[PDB]
Design a protein around this ligand. Structure first.
Ligand code: NAG
Ligand code: NAG
Lengths: 212, 231, 210
């Protein structure tokens, strides 16, 4: 039996686009029924890294399961986790991806953050995150205290450091900022660690699955 | 849980320089916040003075600007305001306050497009005058056998001839709060202020319970604890 | 510029709207602050009808074009205060702007006759060769009252100072009057009197140097 994604791409479904009313997922499927969409499924404009690879690796799964990798109200205590934007509306109210969190300053401060997850699900864990890019420098200072920020995601098989790019842009969906989306597969027992002093679109919910 | 506290002289000579400082607790001055000064002249509304962001520069009310300078000091974790060439028009209650960061482009979550002043200090009073400071004289307003309301009796404190404003009065070191009213001050033709503070107490307690009013005149570094006993 | 009107009345328990007009209201929208005498301003409404913690739900806010409105349903006596709209300009150096302020009065409140206590000059003040008669007026509503002093039975206007009525913590009003005398005048008369007229009727208290 297929995974019925209805009106939604796999991008918007896997990231948790608010407008995807599409049914919460099954435990397995042999293929995916989806609507390709011009604007991907990214309610906030940006670039989805390795989208083609993720699409074919999600074509057939065995033990799919969505779970809360970093609880919203405990993982980021002295950051702000309640950011919403008009470009990701839900029933006419501003919202955000249901699988990610837009971390910004709290009380004018964005302290160095660090968090780690150990894959005890006895299967591969699909972690997704984003990197945000303001359009001017003073706005990078507003929401993140730091001007030259960094994001570092490392596991035993994955390691990359991200730096924001501040540039004037055209408005896509009324927005001049950008969020680039990234993902990796965590093998059982492996640890993934997130480090940043700004611009991280932190993972909130992740997925455990078995391809095939 | 950021909290602010103004401090500075309550009296400035005409054409002198006003100098105030706002102490910050539960937060850091090295932030993206807009540390803000606001004042209220007597009988007038709120007036924006200026703002500063650490690493982001300053922004002033054009009506001032020439005489107003706002700066920070990360070491002592406070920001300050200096207003030169003061006149009677600069007499006001000055407030420090915190304005959270805001965004200028379509790159941030929605809350960074709202302006509001999140935290406020309690305000400090600055009067511009050439007259000299004067501490107050405190006299009892003792209750008498005619001055009673049955089970209730009114007693008070007369705070006389002080300058400048303000004066605050508590009773029994703050242990007595219910039924307390401190009146606004009168300005006499001598230029000196006077006010009263009254508290209603059980008249059956007049011979037993001790009653002391605590007068505070920070604009002369004076505290007076005045015992009030029956006539 | 940012304009609001300086006074508005509402009957106790009814609904009041306090509107503020200005082109800066488009953009960073409006903030509202409750200002009470001797207290720091309190932010009550900001954003799209956002309320800080500790503010009753009776408060609400909405913005039209260049008009923003603070709404108080079931207005209580505690809500009497000055209310200022506040915004940040988007053009130029983006200054912060304040409205002129609106004074909110609450009506249909219970009427109360003034409680008057007249204190003679204290023995300590007389020994300092001064003499102040202190007349404290309290617990009256509405907050309008006229004071008059008498030496014996003749009116006295020299050396009189009276404050403007001010709210107590129980939402009733209080006021004070002072008559300054020399100790020689104080003892030279048989009595002095504080006359307090409130809503047509008068309470008089009398002290005697004997
Ligand atoms: C907004 C929109 O297009 N919604 C449609 C819905 O009406 C339809 O029932 C469903 C599949 O039948 O696909 C989606
Ligand atoms: C964040 O760090 C500061 C600094 O120690 C601390 O005071 C604050 O309590 C932390 N946040 C939370 C939610 O505890």
């Amino acid at each position: 039996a297929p995974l019925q994604l209805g009106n939604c791409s796999v991008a918007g479904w896997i990231l948790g686009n608010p407008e995807c009313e599409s049914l919460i997922s099954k435990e397995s499927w042999s293929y995916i029924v989806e609507t390709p969409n011009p604007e991907n499924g990214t309610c906030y404009p940006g670039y989805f890294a390795d989208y083609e690879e993720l699409r074919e690796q999600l074509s057939s799964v065995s033990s799919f399961e969505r779970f809360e990798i970093f609880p919203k109200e405990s993982s980021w205590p002295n950051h702000t986790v309640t950011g919403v934007t008009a470009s990701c509306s839900h029933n006419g109210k501003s919202s955000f991806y249901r699988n990610l969190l837009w971390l910004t300053e709290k009380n004018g401060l964005y302290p160095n953050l660090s968090n780690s997850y150990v894959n005890n699900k006895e299967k591969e864990v699909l972690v997704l995150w984003g990197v945000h890019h303001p359009s001017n420098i003073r706005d990078q200072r507003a929401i993140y205290h730091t001007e030259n920020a960094y994001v570092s995601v490392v596991s035993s098989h994955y390691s990359r450091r991200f730096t924001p790019e501040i540039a004037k842009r055209p408005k896509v969906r009324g927005q001049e900022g950008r969020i680039n989306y990234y993902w990796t597969l965590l093998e059982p027992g492996d640890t993934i660690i997130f480090e940043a002093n700004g611009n991280l679109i932190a993972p909130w919910y992740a997925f455990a699955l078995s391809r095939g | 849980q950021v909290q602010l506290q103004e401090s500075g002289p309550g009296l400035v000579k005409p054409s002198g320089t006003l100098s105030l400082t706002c102490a910050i607790s539960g937060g850091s001055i090295s932030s993206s916040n807009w540390w803000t000064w606001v004042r209220q002249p007597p009988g007038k509304g709120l007036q924006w003075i200026g703002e500063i962001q650490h690493g982001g520069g300053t922004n002033y009310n054009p009506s001032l600007k020439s005489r107003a300078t706002i700066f920070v000091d990360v070491s002592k974790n406070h920001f300050s305001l200096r207003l030169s060439s003061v006149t009677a028009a600069d007499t006001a209650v000055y407030y420090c306050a915190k304005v959270p960061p805001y965004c200028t482009s379509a790159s941030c979550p929605d809350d960074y497009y709202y302006h509001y002043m999140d935290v406020w200090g309690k305000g400090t009073t600055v009067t511009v005058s050439g007259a000299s400071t004067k501490g107050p004289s405190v006299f009892p307003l003792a209750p008498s056998s005619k001055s009673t309301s049955g089970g209730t009796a009114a007693l008070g404190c007369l705070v006389k001839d002080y300058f400048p404003e303000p004066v605050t009065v508590s009773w029994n070191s703050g242990a007595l709060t219910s039924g307390v009213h401190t009146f606004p001050a009168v300005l006499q033709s001598s230029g000196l202020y006077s006010l009263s503070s009254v508290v209603t107490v059980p008249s059956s307690s007049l011979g037993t319970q001790t009653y002391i009013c605590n007068v505070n005149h920070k604009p002369s570094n004076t505290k007076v604890d005045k015992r009030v006993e029956p006539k | 510029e940012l304009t609001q009107d300086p006074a508005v009345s509402v009957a106790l328990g009814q609904t009041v709207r306090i509107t503020c007009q200005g082109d800066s209201l488009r953009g960073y929208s409006a903030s509202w602050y409750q200002l009470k005498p001797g207290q720091a301003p309190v932010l009550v409404i900001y954003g799209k009808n956002n309320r800080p913690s500790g503010i009753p739900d009776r408060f609400s806010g909405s913005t039209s074009g260049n008009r923003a409105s603070l709404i108080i349903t079931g207005t209580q006596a505690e809500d009497e205060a000055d209310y200022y709209c506040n915004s940040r300009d988007t053009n130029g150096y983006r200054p912060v702007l304040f409205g002129g302020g609106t004074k909110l009065t609450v009506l249909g409140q219970p009427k109360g006759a003034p409680s008057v206590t007249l204190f003679p000059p204290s023995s300590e003040e007389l020994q300092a060769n001064k003499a102040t008669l202190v007349c404290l007026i309290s617990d009256f509503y509405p907050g309008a009252v006229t004071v008059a002093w008498k030496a014996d039975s003749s009116p006295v206007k020299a050396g009189v100072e009276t404050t403007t009525p001010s709210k107590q913590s129980n939402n009733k009003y209080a006021a004070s009057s002072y008559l300054s005398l020399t100790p020689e005048q104080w003892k030279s008369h048989r009595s002095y009197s504080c006359q307090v007229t409130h809503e047509g009727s008068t309470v008089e208290k009398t002290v005697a140097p004997t």
